[PDB]
């Protein structure tokens, strides 16, 4: 019927007809010189209708995402361990998405990257890290229906001193969302994002900074069970003049930093994902064979973390996991950090480049 105070009712049950709510629908940006894109909404309808089941799956996943993040915003507080934050968020996500093997579930581990760490941090077992009042935490989580992934992220703070940094990144992300469209050059989206983000100056503990985009972090095209499908959306000038195409799905995201505006691999790895371009590899090594079978059954090509392997009842798998990485079957995705003492922020939405309109499905 209606959603409970702490959410527990799956999205599927809240919509008995199986028709999930649409995200924000936008007309495409004008075709430079200056031709209108409004014609698409009236043609394109046949091509849009053909993929209705696909858009409907993204919508169910997007509704689960909205209700989980509204729940997260109501209780996330300093003093909580990073493990409890991730477990509370994931328990709600599993329930609302109605987790069912590879058919419905979590598209990737909950990122909760702190301060100079911009992405790919999730605690492993035994991590005693506690969220602090002065922390800047990037909550980045994903849901999927039949591998139709919603990649959506926001930044959590408790100290108002970071307000302008968050506004800079939010404005840069909304710019990217507005600039995106069929036949738009990916380098143009990048330059517009940078121009907006770099117009902001911030003061944190008596020090001033110009907000800079993290040049080696970017938005990207999304494929079925494939978080990155091949096209990169830069967030600085100097990128590639490759164009966005009809029917594509993008994660439009920006990262702002008071640091160097560049990230490097740091800390213990938590995130792993099977390489999409590797076919069948016969393995005789028993622990390695077992772990690969666990990955193929539970995750396929979706990203996973060590906590999820622990949750499945696996143990003493670290060497088997390293073997899969050395064989090129699995790739590690360690935390990406800017310089010590720097602050990073992120905002992200998933968009559908439908033949009729641009739908910000996660908004
Ligand atoms: C850098 C990062 C990648 O994906 C990292 C993925 C997998 C692990 C976590 N992860 C996440 C988590 C949250 N949000 C995300 N948005 C995009 N990816 N992403 C690559 C994928 C494919 N080829 C090149 C790549 C280079
Ligand atoms: Mn993300
Ligand atoms: Mn992303």
UniProtKB/Swiss-Prot annotation:
Q: Where is it chiefly localized? A: cytoplasm
Enzyme's top EC category: hydrolase
Q: Where does this protein hold a divalent metal cation 2?
A: 151, 220, 253, 348
Q: What is its EC number?
A: 3.4.11.18
Kindly provide the PTM information from the record: Contains approximately 12 O-linked N-acetylglucosamine (GlcNAc) residues. O-glycosylation is required for EIF2S1 binding.
Q: List the disulfide bonds.
A: none
Instruction: Name the reaction it catalyses.
Output: Release of N-terminal amino acids, preferentially methionine, from peptides and arylamides
Q: Cofactor(s) for this protein?
A: Co(2+); Zn(2+); Mn(2+); Fe(2+)
Positions contributing to a divalent metal cation 1 binding: 140, 151, 348
Q: One MF term in GO for this entry?
A: aminopeptidase activity
Q: Which GO terms of the cellular component aspect does the record hold?
A: cytoplasm; cytosol; plasma membrane
Q: How is the cofactor bound?
A: Binds 2 divalent metal cations per subunit. Has a high-affinity and a low affinity metal-binding site. The true nature of the physiological cofactor is under debate. The enzyme is active with cobalt, zinc, manganese or divalent iron ions. Most likely, methionine aminopeptidases function as mononuclear Fe(2+)-metalloproteases under physiological conditions, and the catalytically relevant metal-binding site has been assigned to the histidine-containing high-affinity site. Also manganese has been proposed to be the physiological cofactor for human METAP2.
Q: Does the keyword Phosphoprotein apply?
A: yes
Q: Has UniProt tagged this entry with the keyword Acetylation?
A: yes
Domain of life assignment: Eukaryota
Q: Where in the cell is it found?
A: Cytoplasm
Which keywords has UniProt assigned to this entry?
Answer: Acetylation, Aminopeptidase, Cytoplasm, Glycoprotein, Hydrolase, Metal-binding, Phosphoprotein, Protease
**Residues annotated for substrate binding in this entry:** 120, 228
Q: Tell me the function of this protein.
A: Cotranslationally removes the N-terminal methionine from nascent proteins. The N-terminal methionine is often cleaved when the second residue in the primary sequence is small and uncharged (Met-Ala-, Cys, Gly, Pro, Ser, Thr, or Val). The catalytic activity of human METAP2 toward Met-Val peptides is consistently two orders of magnitude higher than that of METAP1, suggesting that it is responsible for processing proteins containing N-terminal Met-Val and Met-Thr sequences in vivo. Protects eukaryotic initiation factor EIF2S1 from translation-inhibiting phosphorylation by inhibitory kinases such as EIF2AK2/PKR and EIF2AK1/HCR. Plays a critical role in the regulation of protein synthesis.
Oligomeric and partner information: Interacts strongly with the eIF-2 gamma-subunit EIF2S3. Binds EIF2S1 at low magnesium concentrations.
State the family it belongs to.
Belongs to the peptidase M24A family. Methionine aminopeptidase eukaryotic type 2 subfamily.
Name of the protein in question = Methionine aminopeptidase 2
- Species of the source: Homo sapiens (Human)
Question: Lineage from the top down?
Answer: Eukaryota, Metazoa, Chordata, Craniata, Vertebrata
Per the record, the gene is METAP2
